[PDB]
Design a protein around this ligand. Structure first.
Ligand SMILES: O=c1cc(O)n([C@@H]2O[C@H](COP(=O)(O)O)[C@@H](O)[C@H]2O)c(=O)[nH]1
Ligand SMILES: O=c1cc(O)n([C@@H]2O[C@H](COP(=O)(O)O)[C@@H](O)[C@H]2O)c(=O)[nH]1
Lengths: 218, 219
């Protein structure tokens, strides 16, 4: 996956007008948008098609898929029907649940991203201790795309080590949660950035500034 | 706790409006509590919750297995309750802050959180099972009153009931298609969740009635 400026916008605004306006303001800096449940549950799955129509951007559906295999299959089918290019799936529920998603993605010409360790403090309670094993499970299953935490660069580096340089790794927690753009890109192919851009006084300037700070990495 | 008619919750995972409305309508004399998940919501929109309320007046549990960071969890719960869900199901695996975020919104909005501890499918054994007792204890510490645990592992369901105490509300999926037994599950759960055994039946009303007949002495 070729992400412009190694920067993925996490569009978690919850009304269509603001989401479209802000995305439009930063469109020159990106070609990949992560759309999650905050926007989808507020404005409907049709918002994915609207983004493709307006911006011609790649769409990653950040749905943290975390159900049994049968339900995971249905969620992936509905998601890809809406035009998502990729979907993010939790590794915690195990191999069968991930495989169900991989199967649908293969059938519809899409990608699965496996979320290993999460970026927030609560991740330390249960997920962190399983995260290396979840990553190895991804490798065993032939997963090529992964998500890991900007807020813990040593854990992000370990995830990169497990999955290899050939795998694709994206990383949230940059900015608002305390992760540094440039340090994160030592290990991740692309950074995910939400609030630092979409809550900024001037989202375009915010995006431009982040990119300026990683200029030598592009 | 919510008064679930016949201790039976429909998992309405059909993916088109017409079929989902037909089946739910056909079983409404038996079931006043419906679990609506992403298969139906992502296919038909959040307004499906509105339509179920309008047509059936059933309680709605939004099975969204909320599993994000606290900030995103809050947004998901807000959007879900705004649409009229009575309750939302939240994963415990992402830890205490993520659960607390959901509890805070539920409190502010006058709705309920259900905490998913262990899951019912085989893959649950890899990671979630080993954390489930602690996830449950965490729920109790946070003041969670409603829980979800697996019909398919009676020994685990029993332990989770012990941890949360008799006063907590426990619902349990995996009954029927996944192999769990209705009556056995109701030894520990307040209510059973049933999807395919009802919604794929030639006569969903008859399927629901049959399940209820089998647990008649437990009502
Ligand atoms: O571990 C993770 C995984 C995520 O997908 N995310 C997501 O990435 C985005 C982070 O946004 P922000 O830059 O505003 O902190 C949110 O949409 C969040 O749901 C995360 O923060 N941590
Ligand atoms: O551990 C769990 C948690 C669930 O919510 N579920 C949900 O409960 C329902 C089970 O449906 P069924 O009776 O068709 O197996 C599905 O909606 C599934 O997503 C589950 O099966 N196992």
């Amino acid at each position: 996956m070729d992400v412009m400026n190694r920067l993925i916008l996490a569009m978690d605004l919850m009304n269509r007008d603001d989401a479209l306006r802000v995305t439009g303001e930063v469109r020159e800096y990106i070609d990949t948008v992560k759309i999650g449940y905050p926007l989808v549950l507020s404005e409907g799955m049709d918002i994915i098609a609207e983004f493709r129509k307006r911006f011609g951007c790649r769409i990653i559906a950040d749905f943290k898929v975390a159900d049994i295999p049968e339900t995971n299959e249905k969620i992936c089918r509905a998601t890809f029907k809406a035009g998502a290019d990729a979907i993010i799936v939790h590794g915690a529920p195990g191999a069968d649940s991930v495989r169900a998603c991989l199967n649908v993605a293969e059938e519809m010409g899409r990608e699965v991203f496996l979320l290993t360790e999460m970026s927030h403090p609560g991740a330390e309670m249960f997920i962190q201790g399983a995260a290396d094993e979840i990553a190895r499970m991804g490798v065993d299953l032939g997963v090529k795309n992964y998500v890991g935490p900007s807020t813990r660069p040593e854990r992000l580096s370990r995830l990169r080590e497990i999955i290899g340089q050939d795998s694709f790794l994206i990383s949230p927690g940059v900015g608002a949660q305390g992760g540094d753009p440039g340090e994160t890109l030592r290990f991740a192919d692309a950074i995910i950035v939400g609030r630092s851009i979409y809550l900024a006084d001037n989202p375009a300037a915010a995006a431009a500034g982040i990119i300026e700070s990683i200029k030598d990495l592009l």
